[PDB]
Design a protein around this ligand. Structure first.
Ligand code: U0S
Length: 185
C-alpha cells in the first residue's frame, strides 16, 4: 500500500470515553483504568464497553492513521458513524454504523454480522487504517508485515460523518492492561 501520504493526525476525544478509560495528556494514548476515573456522565460516553472516539470528523477524501496494539490480548479498531449508539448493548457491525476488526481469544476477525475470520501470518504490533470516503472503502494493513492487507470493507454506507473508533478491551485476565497508542507520522 502507498497510503501513508494521506496520513492524518488523530487525537482522542475525552468526552466520548467510557468513564474507566485514561487518555494521555497528548490525547494519543488510551488504556483501561482499574476503576471509574472521576468524570461526570454525559450523553456522548460509551456506557457498556471500553470505547472512545477520535476528535476528527471526516465527510470526504482519503485518510490514513496507525495504531500500536503491542502486548494486548483483546481490542477493536476502525471507524464509525458520528451517530452510533453510545448507551446499552450493541454488536460492532456495518448495520450499526461500525467498520472495524478485532483480536479476541487468539483470533483476528472483521466486525461483519456474523463476524468474518481473518488470515494473518504475522501477528500485528501496529495496524494501518485507510478510509476512502468517496469510494466507500475501509481497509486495514499489517504494519509489522511490510504493510500487507488484512481486510477491506467495500460498498460502505457511511451515511454521515465518520470518526476514528477505538476499543481497548476489558482486562478480566490481568493480561490486557496495555494501551492503544496512535503512532507518529
Ligand atoms: C463476537 C462479538 N464481538 C466480539 N468482540 C467485540 C470486540 C472484542 C474485542 C475487544 O473486546 C471485545 C471482540 C467477539 N466475538
Amino acid at each position: 500500500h502507498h497510503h501513508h501520504h494521506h496520513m492524518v493526525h488523530i487525537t482522542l476525544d475525552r468526552n466520548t470515553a467510557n468513564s474507566w478509560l485514561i487518555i494521555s495528556k497528548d490525547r494519543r494514548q488510551v488504556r483501561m483504568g482499574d476503576t471509574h476515573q472521576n468524570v461526570s456522565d454525559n450523553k456522548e460516553r460509551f456506557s457498556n464497553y471500553p470505547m472512545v472516539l477520535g476528535a476528527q470528523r471526516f465527510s470526504s477524501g482519503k485518510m490514513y492513521w496507525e495504531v500500536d496494539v503491542t502486548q494486548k490480548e483483546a481490542w477493536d479498531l476502525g471507524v464509525c458513524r458520528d451517530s452510533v449508539q453510545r448507551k446499552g448493548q450493541f454488536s460492532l457491525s456495518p448495520e450499526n454504523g461500525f467498520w472495524t476488526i478485532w483480536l479476541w481469544q487468539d483470533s483476528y476477525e472483521a466486525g461483519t454480522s456474523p463476524q468474518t475470520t481473518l488470515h494473518i501470518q504475522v501477528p500485528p504490533c501496529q495496524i494501518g487504517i485507510f478510509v476512502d470516503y468517496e469510494a466507500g472503502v475501509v481497509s486495514f494493513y499489517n504494519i509489522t508485515d511490510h504493510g500487507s492487507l488484512i481486510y477491506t470493507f467495500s460498498e460502505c454506507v457511511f451515511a454521515g460523518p465518520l470518526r476514528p473508533f477505538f476499543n481497548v478491551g476489558f482486562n478480566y485476565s490481568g493480561g490486557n492492561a496495555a494501551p492503544l497508542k496512535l503512532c507518529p507520522l
